[PDB]
């Protein structure tokens, strides 16, 4: 979603589909809504699945360690919406479509609970390095499922590996992790 301009949310997603089409040597499309077909529709389905697969892995920018979930007002039930890719940092297991607690055998919560949450975020609002990886991985998966060529898959495998490294460097640059002053245990030992 782009609140500044709704065009950017659709133009970016058009290019992603328009780029996976070129992975198998297809002429670009102009309008996504007015071009149904059975090939664009397959392309969007793979792009959607790959998008949340990479996001659910957990990165320094899409992980919120201080996320809170308000458990209603009268009842104490937290709905387990499908946007929650992974709720960790506790013992919450999605018992019956609601947020369970495992450690305490309860489903109702008195007040908001803090937890490390990963929320499904739109493709167009990802880092550019991750946007390239999502498209390249999706196009590689879109080749094997439907076209299934040989030299195309060999070339796409190299591109996905090359694109994955770029995300790994950005993940390190974003967090700039430290084993002396950023480390959660050595910091105490350094103290003198």
């Amino acid at each position: 979603m782009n609140m500044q301009d709704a065009y950017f949310g659709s133009a970016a997603e058009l290019d992603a589909v328009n780029e996976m089409l070129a992975a198998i040597g297809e002429s670009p499309v102009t309008t996504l809504d007015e071009d149904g077909s059975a090939d664009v529709a397959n392309a969007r389905r793979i792009l959607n699945r790959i998008n949340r697969q990479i996001q659910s892995k957990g990165w320094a920018f899409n992980i919120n360690e201080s996320a809170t979930l308000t458990p209603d007002a009268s009842t104490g039930l937290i709905p387990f919406r499908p946007a929650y890719l992974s709720i960790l940092g506790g013992q919450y297991i999605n018992r019956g479509g609601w947020v369970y607690d495992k450690s305490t055998g309860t489903d109702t919560f008195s007040g908001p609970i803090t937890v490390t949450l990963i929320t499904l975020q739109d493709y167009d609002e990802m880092p550019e390095c991750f946007r390239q990886w999502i498209v390249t991985k999706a196009s590689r998966q879109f080749n094997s499922r439907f076209f299934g060529a040989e030299d195309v898959e060999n070339s796409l495998a190299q591109e996905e590996m090359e694109a994955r490294m770029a995300c790994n460097e950005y993940e390190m640059d974003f967090g700039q992790y430290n084993m002396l002053d950023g480390d959660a245990y050595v910091q105490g030992l350094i103290g003198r």
Binding site: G188, L189, G191, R192
Partner: protein, 48 residues
């Protein structure tokens, strides 16, 4: 002044201060650093 039963004795005296500083303070930092290293070494043996 010379003969008072209450004699406050201090070591490592710093001017302008009402009290002295202990001798261990000059080496407390090394004691803290050695404490952490010795703790972790014993911790590894218990894993072993």
């Amino acid at each position: 002044l010379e003969e008072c039963p209450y004699i406050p004795v201090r070591m490592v005296r710093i001017d302008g201060e009402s009290y002295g500083r202990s001798y261990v303070e000059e080496y407390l930092g090394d004691l803290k650093s050695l404490e952490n290293l010795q703790e972790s070494i014993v911790k590894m043996a218990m894993i072993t």
